[PDB]
Design a protein around this ligand. Sequence first.
Ligand code: HEM
Ligand code: CAM
Length: 405
Amino acid sequence: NLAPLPPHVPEHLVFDFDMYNPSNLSAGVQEAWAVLQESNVPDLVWTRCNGGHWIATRGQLIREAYEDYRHFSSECPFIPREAGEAYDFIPTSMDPPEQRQFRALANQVVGMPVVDKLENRIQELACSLIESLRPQGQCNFTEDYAEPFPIRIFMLLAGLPEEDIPHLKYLTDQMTRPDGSMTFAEAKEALYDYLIPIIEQRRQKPGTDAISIVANGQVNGRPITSDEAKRMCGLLLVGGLDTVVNFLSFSMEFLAKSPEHRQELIERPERIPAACEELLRRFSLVADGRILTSDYEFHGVQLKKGDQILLPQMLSGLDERENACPMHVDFSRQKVSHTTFGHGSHLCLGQHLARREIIVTLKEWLTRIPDFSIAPGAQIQHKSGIVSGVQALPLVWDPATTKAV
Ligand code: HEM
Ligand SMILES: CC1(C)[C@@H]2CC[C@@]1(C)C(=O)C2
């Protein structure tokens, strides 16, 4: 389902990539997207899929477009257009200067200071989950570790019942990796039904949780509105439920397949943080966009007001012009260049929490479970979308090779 070419699009600029179902998915998700960077593909292409939209293919253009909020507005950040249209999350659906007062509040909630406070719980949960798994000699990493670990911390942070997980997780999934089961708006409404009561409750009778803070915060010297609060919280949820979760599976998938990588981290722990940047570069997983506020000529291509453009965060680090041998994982690269956490005014506030959960996982897993692999005859499937993922990740190990801590 290809939409008819708009008149202003030169036919030589056509490259029909489906962000929801790219061709090479079998090869791995990052490999499926990287087809965009082959020598046959222009720098800026038009895909007829998902209603028709631009895609910038190179780290340079992604960064520029990301910097330029004047032309590339955040108002309609998701493709397809109906989804970008229904999208009303704060601070993400706002541009500067308006975005600023909102970002400042979200920061209060997720920023450095919070990570520092929550450090010991993260470590405690990680060790507990791992130890519980260790003697089994087998899990479902995605369900057994990658889901609980990050989500239970977010639930803790947010002061929401662990009971809600399955329901929230479904809705969040709908937004980034749409099933056909529900439309963006529907999904958005459902999450909103969830949140509304809670905010009301935390407006009246505040706690110390992130929802209590967000609901009672000040923005531009006045108190936040319930609607505003609902709209930030919504984003906090999707951020919390849908990101680190998927990241961890790619990383673990790679570690299960690369013994030499595991050992390097065991022997030279000082490398973990370098390894973390390298894995964030290679297993980058986010692709959203922007909308043209006006007619604009960008690197010689005429964009029309209202055109949407995908600016795949994932792609910058995979760009050979930015990283030599991009598909190769090298913990000792002089310069790991990526935009995994975004670029421009919208740079990820949750980045600090994400790095903390990654590095803890790597250190604590390797400690107890040094030697593991993907289960014989398991075919790992990736998924594509606003946030990519791994369907399931069956691992096996000999318990006798494990170490209790
Ligand atoms: C591997 C993990 C993560 C990645 C790859 C990631 C990626 C991103 C990307 C690429 C953006 C920018 C979007 C744009 O410019 O439209 C974004 C923004 C944001 N992320 Fe993260 N994120 C991660 C984890 C999280 C966490 C754990 C949270 C907290 C719950 C979170 C909260 C946010 C927020 C609030 C923003 C928007 C800030 C603003 O618009 O000023 N993210 N993230
Ligand atoms: C692109 C993102 C990864 C970022 C945090 C959650 C997400 C889906 C958005 O709506 C902004």
